[PDB]
Design brief:
The structure is cut from a larger assembly and holds 7 protein chains of 7 kinds. Chain A is an all-beta fold and 63 residues long. Chain A is 0% helix and 40% strand. Chain A has strands spanning 4-11, 22-28, 35-40, 49-52. A 4-stranded antiparallel β-sheet of chain A has the order 3-2-1-4, with no helix packed on it. In chain A, β2 (22-28) and β3 (35-40) form a beta hairpin. Chain B has a single domain, classed as Ribosomal Protein S7 (Orthogonal Bundle), CATH 1.10.455. Chain B has helices at residues 19-23, 77-85, 95-113, 117-128, 148-167, 174-187, 193-208, and strands at residues 29-30, 34-35, 132-137, 140-145. In chain B, α3 (95-113) crosses α6 (174-187), α4 (117-128) packs across α6 (174-187) and α5 packs across α6. The chains are: A mainly beta (63), B mainly alpha (209), C mainly beta (103), D mainly alpha (48), E alpha+beta (125), F alpha/beta (231), G mainly alpha (23). Chains in contact: A-B, A-G, B-C, B-E, B-F, C-F, D-F. The structure holds one RNA strand of 79 nucleotides. It is classed as ribosome. Keywords: 90S, pre-ribosome, snoRNA, snR30, snoRNP, ribosome biogenesis, H/ACA, 18S rRNA, ribosome. Stalled 90S - Utp23-Krr1-deltaC3.
RNA sequence: AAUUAUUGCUCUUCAACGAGGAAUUCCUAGUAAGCGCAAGUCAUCAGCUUGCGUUGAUUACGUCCCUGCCCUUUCACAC
């Protein structure tokens, strides 16, 4: 299946995430208005692109 | 018919400078052979983190790249490959040795593939960067996405570790095994250790999503 | 074995192919294409290899009944390979086709 | 594939040591080292 | 008295001194040509002040560099810094300010450590 | 039609170590193996269900958990199976206390549990066991986790009763051409299959009826041999 | 326990489900 | 004169080893790690101690999710 590319518009704070896991909000590059909340393992900042294998799942707190 | 003349006398220096050094002023090339232009990062989301925009002559830049969090993305990617080749203990600090290994590796890559070896390195890194990973939850594992910087870091680490493993206890040397690893990784041929590890991590992530 | 060295460096072996169990009497490089190595052995099978991935033969040419010990590339046509064998038949192969049987 | 018989000792004791006269002499050197170190420490304590 | 310029380059314990005077194109380091600067693997670091701006900028000058201290890497960086700074200073003293500004822009765009010394002093946290 | 190989002389197939990451194989991990050495008074002995009930009760550990005979008989079954002689089988032991043991396929486990117990005591205290003919280490204690030593392209399953029943030959056929198989078998009396949940891809079942660990290893090995035409 | 905001989402789920069912 | 293997070669014979298990500890830039050189400074040190330069990275630079520790709950505008 094709993969989706989504740009990080904001690194969410005070999430309660597990250490090393960062919760972010990303806006789709294909449709530039749709947004989704995701979990990121690496060091992430704003305005970098994530490659999402699935575009439909909404992320939850990992704890 | 428009022409600009900026050289009004042919230049001859009293000290003799070799001719390949003399053509080196028209374009900056890696080891005076490989061109940083027509080099494209095929995978977007990695354009900012695999940087080839600024040409260099050799892969020994002494800049500070550890002072800031994302300063290491501004580092040239051949320099990062060399820095990851200084790993594994026995050759800690032997950067000239690692630069020599990269030079021979790029020669082998260009001889075998008839391509620009910088492009082969870029394609290898963009292919071997995993796109999804897992993390343990206190033993549940939950699938998460992975940042582009971690993708580049893990790609470089996987390529260098695979090269070391292939070179250990074998006739083949680190330069030959790294050239083979980069060629197979740019091809995506699944023979390479790094592509196998990337597929393994992505498969485990697909399971645990 | 087919061992590909640097032309002026006997210490460094860039490639080593286990082409056959039988002796390989012919190793030639494709004249038009720098990526192709043609090896003829006593398997009575000639094999075209890519220099990049040399784990499997890119093409296997068969149909010789005895001892191919010479091959050649036609200059204008890079798809043609000629194999000469001890049964007396020079077989011309088109590599774009199946290649199991000569044209 | 070939089969190899393992080399192991019945009634194995990790504490106990595994020609023989040389081994006895080496144990005697170990005893000499312990006694010399202990007497050195005792003499130093008495001196202080 | 010919027009001449003296400049310094540093990297750790290494120190290079460049004298750039009016001349014909002799570029010598430690009484030896620039094309013998060792190591081979790092010679282009010494070459790159020449290659960034062109050999025509060096067509009318003589550069003489004396280097002490440090090791091979430190000495190479000291050489290239001293040569770049000597070019900028000679083109500001006896050639035009526009030439000086263009040289400084080229050197700054490539690598500022050609011009300004890289001092890795400790930072307590 | 096709030329014969130059030599039809039969040759011993290569023995597989953890240094070989590439070669397709079958791997069995006997997990939760009860292999613990304890000191009496002075005799170091491997803890036993039959001979050490008083010591187990004094230390508080249940006597039914001290079963190294299961590991012994599973080692006998695996190493005597024809896939091992063909050279396509590797064995790891994952003890309940966290020790990981690599078994060279060329080792001959003693057929009697007394000699097996002595060998396990010396292995657990000396970290390696060599051979009499050549000094090659036939048994080794290696660093955890197992996934460092496992082949790079490997499919991981746990043999479990609750999982759906599969056919081993069809599973091994459905495997890829370059991919190896790793099977986690609980070498324990009565537990539940959390021992390898951090490693495995999936859990599979061999039969509707409950099986012993040796029978499970034998069934999966026989399916592997009929799938790979070893016989 | 839950963070602030997660309680808001679960309350929104429950309440809006009840409201939509009643409507 | 091979009894003294004169000795030579090979086999046999005896011990260890091929980068170090579980546990556990330390560590964020000229830092980890490598390399040598000198000094011997009223305590300390030569079963070594200290200094000096030369090569010189990987990864994090986030977060309170866990494990701890700490702290609070008692000038305008806005809250």
């Amino acid at each position: 299946t094709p993969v989706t590319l989504a740009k990080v518009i904001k690194v969410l704070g005070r999430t309660g995430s597990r250490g090393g896991v960062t919760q972010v909000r990303v806006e789709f590059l294909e449709d530039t208005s749709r947004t989704i909340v995701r979990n990121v393992k690496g060091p992430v900042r704003e305005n970098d692109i994530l490659v999402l294998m699935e575009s439909e799942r909404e992320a939850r707190r990992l704890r | 018919d428009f022409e600009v003349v900026e050289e009004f006398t042919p230049v001859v220096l009293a000290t003799p400078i070799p001719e390949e050094v003399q053509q080196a002023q028209t374009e900056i090339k890696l080891f005076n052979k490989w061109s940083f232009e027509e080099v494209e990062v095929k995978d977007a989301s990695l354009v900012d983190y695999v940087q080839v925009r600024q040409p260099i002559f050799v892969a020994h830049t002494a800049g500070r790249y550890a002072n800031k969090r994302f300063r290491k993305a501004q580092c040239p990617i051949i320099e990062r490959l060399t820095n990851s080749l200084m790993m594994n203990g026995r050759n800690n600090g032997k950067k000239l040795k690692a630069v020599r290994i990269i030079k021979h590796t790029l020669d082998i890559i260009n001889v075998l593939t008839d391509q620009n070896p910088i492009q082969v390195v870029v394609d290898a890194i963009t292919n071997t960067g995993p796109r999804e990973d897992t993390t343990r939850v206190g033993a549940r594992r939950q699938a998460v996405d992975v940042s582009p910087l971690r993708r580049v870091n893990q790609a470089i680490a996987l390529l260098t570790i695979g090269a070391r493993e292939a070179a250990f206890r074998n006739i083949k040397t680190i330069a030959e095994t790294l050239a083979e690893e980069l060629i197979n990784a740019a091809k995506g041929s699944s023979t390479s250790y790094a592509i196998k590890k990337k597929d393994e991590l992505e498969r485990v992530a697909k399971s645990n999503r | 074995l087919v061992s590909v060295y640097d032309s002026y460096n006997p210490r460094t072996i860039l490639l080593s192919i286990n082409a056959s169990t039988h002796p390989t009497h012919v190793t030639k490089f494709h004249t038009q294409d720098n990526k192709i190595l043609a090896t003829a052995s006593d398997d009575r099978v000639t094999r075209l290899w890519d220099i990049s991935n040399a784990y499997e033969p890119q093409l296997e040419l068969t149909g010789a009944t005895d001892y191919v010990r010479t091959l050649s590339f036609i200059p204008a046509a890079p798809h043609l390979v000629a194999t000469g064998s001890y049964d007396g038949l020079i077989r011309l192969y088109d590599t774009r086709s199946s290649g199991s049987t000569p044209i | 594939i070939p089969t190899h018989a393992p080399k192991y000792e019945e009634n194995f004791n990790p504490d106990k040591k595994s020609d023989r006269t040389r081994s006895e002499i080496n144990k005697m050197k170990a005893q000499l080292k312990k006694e010399r170190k202990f007497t050195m420490k005792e003499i130093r304590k008495d001196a202080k | 008295a010919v027009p001449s310029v003296q400049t310094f380059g540093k990297k750790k314990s290494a120190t290079a001194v460049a004298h750039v005077k009016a001349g014909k194109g002799l570029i010598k380091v430690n009484g030896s040509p620039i094309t013998l600067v060792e190591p081979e693997i790092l010679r282009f670091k010494v070459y790159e002040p020449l290659l960034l701006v062109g050999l025509d900028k060096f067509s009318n000058i003589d550069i003489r560099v004396r280097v002490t201290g440090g090791g091979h890497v430190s000495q190479v960086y000291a050489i290239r810094q001293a040569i770049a700074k000597g070019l900028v200073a000679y083109h500001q003293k006896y050639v035009d300010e526009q030439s000086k500004n263009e040289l400084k822009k080229a050197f700054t765009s490539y690598d500022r450590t050609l011009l300004i010394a890289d001092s890795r002093r400790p930072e307590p946290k | 039609q096709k030329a014969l190989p130059a030599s039809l002389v039969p040759q011993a197939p290569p023995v597989l170590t953890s240094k070989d990451k590439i070669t397709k194989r079958m791997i069995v991990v006997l997990a939760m193996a009860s292999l613990e050495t304890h000191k009496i008074s002075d005799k170091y002995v491997l803890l036993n269900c039959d001979d050490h009930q008083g010591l187990l009760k004094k230390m508080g550990r249940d006597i039914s958990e001290a079963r190294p005979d299961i590991t012994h008989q599973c080692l006998l079954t695996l190493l005597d199976s024809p896939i091992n002689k063909a050279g396509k089988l590797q064995v790891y032991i994952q003890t309940s206390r966290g020790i990981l043991i690599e078994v060279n396929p060329t080792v001959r486990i003693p057929r009697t549990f007394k000699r097996f117990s002595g060998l396990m005591v010396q292995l657990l205290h000396k970290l390696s066991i060599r051979s009499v003919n050549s000094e090659e280490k036939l048994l080794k204690v290696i660093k955890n986790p197992i996934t460092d030593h496992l082949p790079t392209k490997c499919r991981k399953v746990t043999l479990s009763f609750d999982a759906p029943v599969i056919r081993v030959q069809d599973y091994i056929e459905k495997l890829d051409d370059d991919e190896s198989i790793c099977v986690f078998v609980g070498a324990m009396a009565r537990g539940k299959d959390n021992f390898a949940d951090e490693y495995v891809d999936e859990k599979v079942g061999l039969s509707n009826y409950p099986l012993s660990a040796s029978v499970a290893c034998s069934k999966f090995c026989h399916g592997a041999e009929d799938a790979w035409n070893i016989l | 326990s839950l963070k602030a905001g997660e309680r808001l989402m679960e309350a929104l789920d429950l309440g809006i489900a009840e409201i939509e069912g009643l409507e």
